[model samples]
Target: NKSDAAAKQIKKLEEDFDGRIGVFAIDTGSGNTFGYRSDERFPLCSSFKGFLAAAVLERVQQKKLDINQKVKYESRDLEYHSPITTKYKGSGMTLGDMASAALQYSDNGATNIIMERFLGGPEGMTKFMRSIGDNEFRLDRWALELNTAIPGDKRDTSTPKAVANSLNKLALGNVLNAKVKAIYQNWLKGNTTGDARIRASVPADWVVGDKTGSCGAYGTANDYAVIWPKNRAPLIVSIYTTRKSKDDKHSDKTIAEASRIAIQAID
Candidate 1:
């Protein structure tokens, strides 16, 4: 049943959009779903922030990190890409605040800073990725420049299945403590890019926590989310796409269509 619906949706998307698209959806409650090219390694873009968030929380659980502790925000530590980095020019924010900003506002600087602290620098981020079972995702080249500025790598990628599994781990409270999970959910709630996948599918009243990622001219786009609807099975969704023309403005629309189709199948 789900596969048929997914096929129809994929057909519709191919008809409307001119580039590659991949989507994965699963019901966290009953384990139901569909996907097309879901296993393909697409550039994670800033969606890596979510994994970084999880990694940090895991450390917190292990007593190696403190979310409440403030980290000095040097201008050199700030990476480019989002609005928050520009807004907060020179100021220190707590680890929790930085994580929140990274997830909620998709702040590149906040993410880079948090990553440096938790991962021990850019190399640490790669090491942390391996610690989280992301052996297939390459972070080597990206790790070369630790304190220097570097653009996101086109080869830095992840699979939808992996993303969904990680999210499921968090949702089931298997990866972090109650306090850390609460903070993660709160950060997800602050996400403003609702026009993308997952968020566009369910009813507006549904509590959808997600992270959206995009890099202009890089052909990388993503929307990973957990939908909590009252009295229904929770859902895990991750939509990823790559290697398209830089002129693609309808990526979000494509994700929305794919999400609607997946939601229909699940319902």
Candidate 2:
């Protein structure tokens, strides 16, 4: 199930990052997989926004919520790092638009708005992941606060392997209806913040879509993506890293390097 070359290079990536690196990749075409520390929990950070948007889409499919419904919020409702929602505070935005902002821009306010108003809270989001068969995924707190990324704390954590499974299920599995799935895929494809992560490592000709997460502490950061090769089916990949020192900065180059190793190993 593991690729030898990937395993070898993953070790080098860990050393280069001066941190622990976790990775999990699935060659959807051949049902093959490879990883390093894929089972260890890492902070979900903004990466959960992608799943949060998917949870909203699921509600839309169930008729519990309307994707196009307009939602207005006050400036007081905005959270830190919420560029998109901050710009449209009083005017409000459609549920679908907010979801797009959350995924594509990693807008914290848009993410919290959807989570608090529609999905209940972190509890509800966690329930959604469980419903989708992700036992190792958990969202214990809201954004900003959730980015604490303490070394031993379990709050807001998911294993890279679990994220890979859940992402593949949400993106390509039967977990989502056709319309919602398409909407979700398009949102991730339009993501603006992942250029330095998985996207940077992949071949220019291949199609790639990803969501990134940065805890901003403890060297915590991650990126997960579904990549389509020229003639191959696709691959689901997740890369996460963390360091012992709280002041340690994250390295985008490390994630990109790990991604390169994962992709070539599968090829």
Candidate 3:
């Protein structure tokens, strides 16, 4: 049960964070997996936005929507969930631009707009996920709706395996739509959040592309990354946690500790 040393090391972080965590890491070339508690579902927080962006890109490839087309938005449409939309009181961006913001900056305004304006909400995203042979991963509310959701409505959810698998597929170009793949890849590659989690303590030579998610109450701090280790083959590393830290400093440190262990364990 403890064959993968990395899996054993990361499990120790749960007790320190006062929480439970799921982690999954895989070598893209060798297909070796290392992880602990990674099969069960957990609230995915904002990490699901990456898949939402995929849904939008899938539509763009199908010509159901135009990524470059400009659109109008109200203040409410800007969403209280992201800094990227805080300054914009009216409309003035293309769908492609919004997509970039959502992926790279975790902009909630752009994410909600992409979900509603392009994919017709969570159901549309689910349809695309099923088409791609995905199950278990899900999205049911807009970025705005999550903060104040009524009971009984579905919320974002995912398993560590699903998160890692989805990222690995994208890293392998399985979701390639030809027209929208590069742009989608660029967003993940340029992501700017989570320096304290997956990005922290990584080798300076390693190139990392990932999406991060955080929730204060549940102490959900997560990262799903495609790590390119210099000239070597890449690895997919995904981690998720649920805890009691409202500020999440302890939560982030727990993840950082796990990431350091993972980096060392891989090579």
Candidate 4:
């Protein structure tokens, strides 16, 4: 069982990192897979922003929202770590641009605004995921608040398998309308974060895009990606980690090494 070998290696990696790790990866080409603690819940952190953007795009596809409409907010409305959204506060930005900031830059303010004004908050985001056939994923809180990766709490958490499955649908599968899919893919491809995780593990020629989350405490961080090999159907990989101690630091190397192990399992 190649997946078993992969899981063993990943377990050792988690041991070495002094944290719990979860991974679920699938090769869309042959439907090959590797899983380690894939069903266990881990805090979502900023990773939910990707799906938030997806929900917005779905609404756009249904003509319920315009992606090009400009939205204005005051400086006080900006949340901590909102670099992109803060820049466009006075001048305003299109809904598409706000979604881009949320997905690509992980802009905290942009995510909250989209969640509050457009999707009706975390509950709405969860509803959208359910509509897409993903019932396990949940978004129970907003940014910053949701990053509280406390041990044993299930709020705003998801399993690695669920993340990978949902990402595959929106990124490579036929879940989104064609036009909406294009917009979603474009946002993901432009993501400025996640260079050191899944991206570092794959071959340079294998195109990749990912959403990343780093909760400043509890050693919790994650990356989920859509990776394209030159001659094969794209692969979807989700890696999530958490440590028992609040002060433990998240490790990009851990995720990258785990991703390499996963790809080797299915290759």
Using TM-score, give the best candidate's number: 4
Better of 3 and 4 by lDDT: 4
lDDT values, one for every candidate: 0.69, 0.89, 0.72, 0.91
User: What CA RMSD would candidate 4 show?
Assistant: 1.0
What TM-score does model 2 achieve against the real structure? 0.97
RMSD to the native, candidate 2? 1.3
Which residues of candidate 2, in runs, are more than 4 Å off? none
- What is the TM-score (0 to 1) of candidate 4? 0.98
lDDT of 4 by residue, 129-188 (tens): 998899889988889799889999999999999999999999977878787887798888
Candidate 2 lDDT, 155-200, residue by residue in tens: 9999999999999999999978898898889888899999999999
Clashing pairs in 2: none
C-alpha lDDT of candidate 4 relative to the true structure: 0.91
Candidate 1 backbone clash number: 0
Global CA lDDT computed for model 1 = 0.69
TM-score on alpha carbons, each prediction: 0.86, 0.97, 0.88, 0.98
Model 1, 71-114: lDDT tens digits are 77555645555467656556677777777777777777777666
